[PDB]
Design a protein around this ligand. Structure first.
Ligand SMILES: [Zn+2]
Ligand SMILES: [Zn+2]
Ligand SMILES: [Zn+2]
Ligand SMILES: [Zn+2]
Ligand SMILES: [Zn+2]
Ligand SMILES: [Zn+2]
Ligand SMILES: [Zn+2]
Ligand SMILES: [Zn+2]
Ligand SMILES: [Zn+2]
Ligand SMILES: [Zn+2]
Ligand SMILES: [Zn+2]
Ligand SMILES: [Zn+2]
Lengths: 115, 115, 115, 116
């Protein structure tokens, strides 16, 4: 995959499963244009978002939907999304994995960029 | 302060000093409206961003300048900013400390929300 | 302070208050010798642990009690402590701040070392 | 695997490759008994540490060797290891992935515990 997203639930110690992930690319008018979307697997992973061709240099926002994810724990999070922004491909084509460890009022995200 | 931003450099183990920070509030047309800015102190802190009356309910983005911060380490970071989005107040006044532990390809960020 | 410990609750977005912190130093027999202890303040901070003289070079472990800290959330954590080990003082006095942002199955720690 | 360790280099945005990892299990005299070891793969992963039956209930320490890992950056880290302690395998069998995002003066670790 040119772009993979992996989401972990840092409260329960488990993959974040079936969580909506929307990816955007900064457009000509400075707004965020919808780029790719999916839901995380049983493993907290979202593969197949994009193709090498579609995935040109630019600024991308990964939006993880955290709104009702910790409803059952009875806490409303700091925000309805966990967002990670990265600047891409900005020296030829590379594979990205965006790994996010999520808690309601914290998060740790790491971009692993390969090739 | 109604809003304080604290920035640590996780690579060198030191406050991130003289780092530019921009705060935005989500406006009616879905643009980010400039809200406050400044540079971090010797302790990595940015105090005095806003007043309790100016700190109205809304969605806020904190944008920490990272572009050339690790230039001396010879590393280009994942993005020119580290960004944190939070949804504010909703319940009477609250004070927010946004704490960010930064490396070129990872960051951890926590919103501490009190009274 | 020569050594300060600050603990944040990353699930609720608040300082972790009145949490027991024990500090140990690696002894002659490779065991952990009790060094200092206290409880975090209302700000999640623990000051006054040690003195510049007592705080010699060596290997130190900060043990944060997390056993029953999230009991009210109904999750048992990955372990009864959050532990940070650091190697100290290679030169003369350094002041350490150990910042720990804690979730039941994740934690981010950072050591800020200042001269 | 009953136990997998995955290590990422948060400074360079890469897997931490060929990094030594030591696992210990807490023994009755309060000593850490060596349990398993190895070095991370090209993906930053260390698989094959243990078997379901060897991975008995107990307290485990994972020790990732960081001493010289950022030597090329010219930084000496906060400690010669990044360490994670976890209390294991209550409630029948569970598989653990210990995921560590490392920088010289910070790390984020997560235990992902699943029931197979
Ligand atoms: Zn894939
Ligand atoms: Zn979304
Ligand atoms: Zn959002
Ligand atoms: Zn800015
Ligand atoms: Zn202030
Ligand atoms: Zn940005
Ligand atoms: Zn103090
Ligand atoms: Zn204790
Ligand atoms: Zn322990
Ligand atoms: Zn070792
Ligand atoms: Zn495996
Ligand atoms: Zn160690």
């Amino acid at each position: 995959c040119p772009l993979m997203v992996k989401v972990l639930d840092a409260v329960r110690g488990s993959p974040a499963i079936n969580v909506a992930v929307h990816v955007f690319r900064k457009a000509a008018d400075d707004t965020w244009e919808p780029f790719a979307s999916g839901k995380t697997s049983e493993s907290g992973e979202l593969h197949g978002l994009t193709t090498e061709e579609e995935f040109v240099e630019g600024i991308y926002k990964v939006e993880i939907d955290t709104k009702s994810y910790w409803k059952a724990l009875g806490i409303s999070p700091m925000h309805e999304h966990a967002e990670v922004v990265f600047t891409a491909n900005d020296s030829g084509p590379r594979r990205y994995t965006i790994a996010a460890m999520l808690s309601p009022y914290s998060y740790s995200t790491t971009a692993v960029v390969t090739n």
